[PDB]
Amino acid sequence: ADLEDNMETLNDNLKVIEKADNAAQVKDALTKMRAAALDAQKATPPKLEDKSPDSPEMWDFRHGFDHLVGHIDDALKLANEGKVKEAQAAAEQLKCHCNACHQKYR
Numbered sequence: 001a002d003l004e005d006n007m008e009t010l011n012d013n014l015k016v017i018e019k020a021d022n023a024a025q026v027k028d029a030l031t032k033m034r035a036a037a038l039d040a041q042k043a044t045p046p047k048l049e050d051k052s053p054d055s056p057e058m059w060d061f062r063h064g065f066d067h068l069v070g071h072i073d074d075a076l077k078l079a080n081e082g083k084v085k086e087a088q089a090a091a092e093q094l095k096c097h098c099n100a101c102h103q104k105y106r
């Protein structure tokens, strides 16, 4: 529901994907990461809570989720075709995009 909830949904299911035994389990966690990322996209981070919603930082925030969802969708294609290792490495690519948004706005 709130930005913290979604942030932990991303964090949790990253672990699920790391520990998964097949690609369908990976696809499961990713689908939950997809929904958590779009929810997060709608929130206003406390760091930016004093900024215009039309401000360059507010669009940067939202566009980081666009890029994160784009990674998830490309990991899903792999996951849906049974390549568990490829899809798990796909998800590991996400981490640098997590961290990059954190540096600015966490």
Ligand code: HEC
Pocket: 003, 004, 005, 007, 008, 010, 011, 014, 045, 046, 060, 061, 062, 063, 064, 065, 068, 094, 095, 097, 098, 099, 101, 102, 105, 106
């Ligand atoms: C901005 C475009 C983000 C991206 C992409 C990701 N995260 Fe994030 N995260 C972001 C903010 C602005 C915050 C602070 C929220 C607040 O209420 O102060 C966070 C915080 C987290 C946390 C822990 C903090 C908490 O409230 O529990 C975690 C565990 C976390 N974020 C995880 C995470 C992961 C794994 C991501 C990549 C899949 C990721 N985040 C992306 C902003 C953004």
Ligand SMILES: [Ca+2]
Pocket: 070, 074
């Ligand atoms: Ca793509």
Ligand SMILES: [Fe+3]
Pocket: 067, 071, 097
């Ligand atoms: Fe990228």
